[PDB]
Ligand binder design. Structure first.
Ligand SMILES: Nc1ncnc2c1ncn2[C@@H]1O[C@H](COP(=O)(O)OP(=O)(O)OC[C@H]2O[C@@H](O)[C@H](O)[C@@H]2O)[C@@H](O)[C@H]1O
Lengths: 413, 82, 81
């Protein structure tokens, strides 16, 4: 109840449009009596970065991050075969556990958010939840989430109970189960979808610069958007993330909108026309193609060229265990392709990607992409990655760092 | 046969231990001179109010239902990892 | 092959191209053709459709069709329900 002094004195809400101080914040607990409660605060779509920053790291007692990953996908129209779904959750667990990551999504119990939360619950049972709780932060619209009657209160409700309905879901959506934090957003309307996008992108940029002034050098923590497949909203959040230079969108090679960009990303920018995208929309969205306006098609057919304009933020991957290719490979490649073409001359392209390539067992990519023959090295630079490779039993990185310029006489000096 | 029996295994004694464990587990503490003293108590207890409600409590256990699911999920994860 | 090439270019939109060719591809042991030609990546499936071919592949001892139909969308919870 010490946060309640700040949370009714800084953060406002929206009504009627005019703004007022907010309410209806606390800790929600789900159906299981002992399943660990979350923390919910409504913030109505327009707030200061400083107040949200103070909420983010001080009044929720939440430590600094190491790797932010964001998952966008279809809700209420999401279909994937069982084989690809199983390979994706098995890769996403290993991505989410080897690093002290944060994972972010639009948490509502519909589709890809369900497939993320079930992998997170499978791992937190598989881990036993000893220490270092995984943060799965969610951002959902306030208006379209339903049955908030037991949740709206002007004084706080700390053992707040909530039940999954899953029946009255026609124009409203049910809230998810396996998250831990919740930032609900409100535009003053009670029916419209898609409000969350702007604060989602601004929150990504806000999280990205948190690790500054903490250590010796000013290197920002990396962020990655992983898109699986989704309709009109997913293309919007991809474009709104790629407006910010730092996020890097990584696309699955199997889906419906992901197959659209996987087919557009071969031809040059001049080749694509409004007839080609209309042909591909008829081809990939077999059902519900009819419900589309021509003006809405004109909007997408500008969005898609603005996505194809910057080629060093767009990467298509394809999961196959035979060719030794997984999700970590795609994240590492799309993270290395961004930094090499940037305003900075050097000294930041490799520093935080080397430890992340050592934490995962991805030696093969590491050697060519970072240990280019036109580079020069010194052992005092490569000492911490040497320690991290030597403790965690990775002999191949020991073999490689040993001959790229780590001297044992300097290391154990 | 003797050479096949003697050269069969080294795990015969380990298997025997388990044969000892059950009968010397269940039996009351006091030796067979005074075993009727234990029979008097255990026979009097048997017909009045039910005694030893868990007949075997270090071998066979009935897990709580909330624990069971979390237990099975862990070993399914370890099976796929194997 | 000559039976599958005919039906795909026809007056009907769908729902008859695969129904009688799947059981005939399961009765013979021809898995390799079956997967590409019928289990195209642009298709969508439901377990209640694939139940009879699953039964026919499971009785007659063809493990490869069991392996393929299992991961193309036959749920055991729905099959033995
Ligand atoms: N955030 C949502 N939660 C639940 N259902 C939704 C959401 N957004 C849309 N829907 C419903 O799903 C239908 C459209 O589904 P898709 O087109 O497959 O999903 P899309 O509209 O692209 O939205 C993707 C969602 O994921 C997040 O990245 C983002 O916040 C976006 O809301 C719509 O009819 C709508 O009612």
């Amino acid at each position: 109840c010490s946060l309640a002094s700040w949370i009714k004195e800084n953060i406002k809400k929206k009504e009627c449009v005019r703004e007022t101080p907010t309410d209806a914040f606390g800790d929600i607990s789900f159906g299981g009596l002992g399943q660990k409660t979350g923390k919910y605060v409504r913030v109505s779509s327009d707030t200061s970065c400083e107040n949200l920053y103070q909420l983010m790291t001080e009044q929720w007692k939440l430590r600094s991050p190491n790797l932010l990953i964001s998952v966008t996908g279809g809700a209420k129209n999401f279909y994937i075969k069982t084989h690809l779904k199983d390979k994706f959750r098995r890769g996403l667990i290993k991505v989410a556990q080897t690093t002290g990551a944060w994972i972010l999504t639009g948490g509502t119990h519909a589709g890809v958010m369900k497939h993320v939360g079930m992998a997170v619950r499978d791992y937190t049972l598989s881990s036993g939840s000893m220490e270092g709780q995984i943060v799965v932060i969610g951002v959902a619209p306030w208006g379209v989430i339903h049955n908030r009657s037991t949740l709206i209160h002007p004084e706080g409700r700390f053992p707040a109970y909530y039940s999954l309905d899953e029946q009255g879901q026609g124009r409203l959506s049910c809230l998810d189960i396996n998250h831990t934090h919740f930032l609900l957003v409100d535009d003053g309307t009670q029916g419209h979808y898609g409000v969350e996008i702007e604060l989602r992108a601004r929150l990504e940029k806000l999280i990205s610069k948190l690790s500054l002034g903490n250590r010796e050098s000013g290197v920002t923590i990396p962020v990655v958007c992983v898109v699986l497949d989704g309709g009109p909203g997913t293309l919007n959040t991809i474009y709104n993330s790629m407006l910010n230079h730092t996020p890097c969108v990584v696309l699955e090679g199997s889906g419906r909108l992901a197959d659209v960009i996987a087919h557009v990303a071969s031809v040059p920018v001049s080749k694509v026309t409004m007839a080609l995208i209309n042909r591909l929309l008829k081809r990939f969205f077999m059902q519900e193609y009819k419900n589309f306006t021509e003006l809405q098609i004109i909007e997408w057919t500008k969005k898609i060229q603005d996505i194809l304009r910057m080629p060093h933020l767009l990467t298509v991957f394809r999961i196959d265990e035979d060719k030794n290719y997984d999700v970590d490979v795609a994240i590492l490649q799309a993270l290395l392709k961004a930094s090499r073409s940037d305003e900075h001359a050097g000294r930041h392209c490799w520093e935080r990607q080397l430890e992340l390539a050592v934490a995962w067992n991805r030696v093969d990519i590491a050697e060519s992409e970072i240990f280019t023959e036109e580079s020069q090295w010194t052992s005092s630079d490569l000492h911490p990655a040497m320690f991290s490779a030597l403790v965690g039993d990775k002999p191949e990185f020991v073999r490689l760092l040993l001959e790229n310029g780590v001297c044992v006489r300097e290391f154990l000096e | 046969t003797f050479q096949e029996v003697q050269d069969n295994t080294d795990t015969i004694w380990k298997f025997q231990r388990y044969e000892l464990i059950k009968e010397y587990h269940s039996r009351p503490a006091l030796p067979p001179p005074f075993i009727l003293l234990s029979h008097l108590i255990l026979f009097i207890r048997g017909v009045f109010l039910r005694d030893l409600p868990q007949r075997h409590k270090n071998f066979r256990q009935e897990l709580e239902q909330t624990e069971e699911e979390e237990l099975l999920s862990w070993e399914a994860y370890m099976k796929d990892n194997y």
